[PDB]
Design a binder for this molecule. Structure first.
Ligand SMILES: CCOC(=O)c1cc(C#N)c(N2CCC(C(=O)NS(=O)(=O)Cc3ccccc3)CC2)nc1C
Ligand SMILES: CC(C)CCC[C@@H](C)[C@H]1CC[C@H]2[C@@H]3CC=C4C[C@@H](O)CC[C@]4(C)[C@H]3CC[C@]12C
Ligand SMILES: CC(C)CCC[C@@H](C)[C@H]1CC[C@H]2[C@@H]3CC=C4C[C@@H](O)CC[C@]4(C)[C@H]3CC[C@]12C
Ligand SMILES: CCCCCCCC/C=C\CCCCCCCC(=O)OC[C@H](O)CO
Ligand SMILES: CCCCCCCC/C=C\CCCCCCCC(=O)OC[C@H](O)CO
Length: 369
């Protein structure tokens, strides 16, 4: 009844899925070849191995979509394959949530460092549960089928929204740890450059007020650096007392009056011994964190692919009284659903990027080929 442009409906979208089909088949194709050679020594490799299977199963659905949309039983095959598609996308969402938890657990653990049987069972449970809830939607004109369809769709939304929350919480806790790590390093680097910059002010100063003020900044910066530099586990305690001592010595001289003596007492921080102490103390406090541009690839893939579809569904699932009648609203619903479903399908082409940037043995094998 409602008509749309064939150039978008039967040309653009079948070609848009054709790109994803070949791109997905070649990236996941060589991904399976790489994973078949390397052994599962962690939960991470196991969940990534399962993702390859769900991606390959996803790609195999696209020829049925491409052919149906370009207008080329025919209705039965594009009814079974659509069930296989939604089965395969809620499996990917499920494993991506597990990959997120695993990666977060490794950021909470020390840098560069029993669940292998458990991760295998958990993976079996995901696939078996999805297959079982997909099964009646496949073969099984009954009113049971209508209510079962609403049950399955409800279960699947709860799967997305639970994994969306796991992703938001894990990346909130990661950002928080990365922020506090960056702030600690920046403040400490600021402390040592404040100490060195105010030495230059003292060297070029005239009166006592200039000398007294610069030494006050220096003393506070030295004590802040000390606060941020606790004793090492193996002279870090003594070193700061020597440097703070000299600043206090130059300060008490600047308070008594003598400016040339205070400038020279401050210049003592430039002796080979006092410079070596400063260079050592800078090193002790310079102590590894998780890579920003790398870890955040999961949240980026999750948001690009699955977030638009499930967010767009909210207004269309609690507003219109049964159905809308205006053609301009029916067509905006068609393109919103079709465009977000394509973004969802792009997960099959974007997951090989997770293997590349987060698995070292995968990256080296692909580079060697
Ligand atoms: C485990 C596999 O389970 C399945 O086989 C399975 C699972 C789901 C699910 N979920 C599913 N639905 C079909 C109906 C669709 C929807 O609600 N369309 S809309 O009414 O037009 C609102 C709208 C608007 C914009 C964007 C998106 C949706 C949502 C996906 N179908 C199947 C077959
Ligand atoms: C849907 C309603 C009722 C809210 C329930 C939210 C549940 C399913 C989710 C959302 C965020 C989740 C948590 C996110 C963070 C972690 C840390 C990780 O080391 C283990 C899992 C754990 C502890 C998750 C378990 C389940 C959790 C609490
Ligand atoms: C760069 C990556 C993330 C992929 C880009 C995907 C997005 C931004 C693009 C590519 C193809 C696009 C769609 C192509 C078809 C139409 C029909 C037109 O009448 C309105 C816009 C609409 C509905 C587009 C919206 C945005 C869209 C889904
Ligand atoms: C109010 C309701 C509260 C919901 C409570 C919990 C839901 C837990 C769901 C998370 C299940 C995932 C299991 C898991 O975290 O283990 C994987 C980990 O990577 C080890 O391999
Ligand atoms: C791209 C990823 C960013 C994710 C942005 C998620 C916002 C959802 C965009 C969307 O789907 O808007 C259509 C609208 O809901 C129609 O009624």
């Amino acid at each position: 009844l409602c008509t749309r442009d064939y150039k978008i409906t039967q040309v653009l979208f079948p070609l848009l899925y054709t790109v994803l089909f070949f791109v997905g088949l070649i990236t996941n194709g060589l991904a399976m070849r790489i994973f078949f050679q390397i052994r599962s020594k962690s939960n991470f490799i196991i969940f990534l191995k399962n993702t390859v299977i769900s991606d390959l199963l996803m790609i195999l659905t696209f020829p049925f979509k491409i052919l149906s949309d370009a207008k080329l039983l025919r209705t039965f095959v594009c009814q079974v394959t659509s069930v296989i598609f939604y089965f395969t996308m809620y499996i990917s969402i499920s494993f991506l949530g597990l990959i997120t938890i695993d990666r977060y657990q490794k950021t909470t653990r020390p840098f560069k460092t029993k669940n292998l049987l458990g991760a295998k069972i958990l993976s079996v449970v995901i696939w078996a549960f999805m297959f079982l809830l997909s099964l009646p939607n496949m073969i099984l004109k009954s009113e049971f089928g209508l209510v079962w369809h609403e049950i399955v769709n409800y279960i699947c939304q709860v799967i997305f929204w639970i994994n969306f929350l796991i992703v938001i919480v894990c990346y909130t806790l990661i950002t928080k740890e990365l922020y506090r790590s960056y702030v600690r390093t920046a403040d400490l680097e600021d402390n040592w450059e404040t100490l060195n910059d105010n030495l230059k002010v003292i060297e070029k100063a005239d009166n006592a007020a200039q000398v007294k003020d610069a030494l006050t900044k220096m003393r506070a910066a030295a004590l802040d650096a000390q606060k941020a530099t606790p004793p090492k586990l193996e002279d870090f305690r003594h070193g700061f007392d020597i440097l703070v001592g000299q600043i206090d010595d130059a300060l008490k001289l600047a308070n008594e009056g003598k400016v040339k003596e205070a400038q020279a007492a401050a210049e003592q921080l430039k002796t080979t011994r006092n410079a070596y102490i400063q260079k050592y103390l800078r090193g002790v406090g310079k102590v590894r964190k998780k890579v920003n541009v790398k870890v955040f690839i999961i949240i980026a893939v999750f948001f690009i692919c699955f977030v638009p579809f499930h967010f767009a569904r909210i207004p269309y699932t609690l507003s219109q009284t049964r159905d809308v009648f205006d053609c301009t609203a029916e067509n905006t619903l068609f393109y919103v659903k079709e465009s977000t479903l394509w973004l969802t399908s792009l997960n099959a082409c974007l997951n090989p990027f997770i293997y590349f940037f987060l698995c070292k043995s995968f990256r080296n094998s692909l580079i060697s080929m």
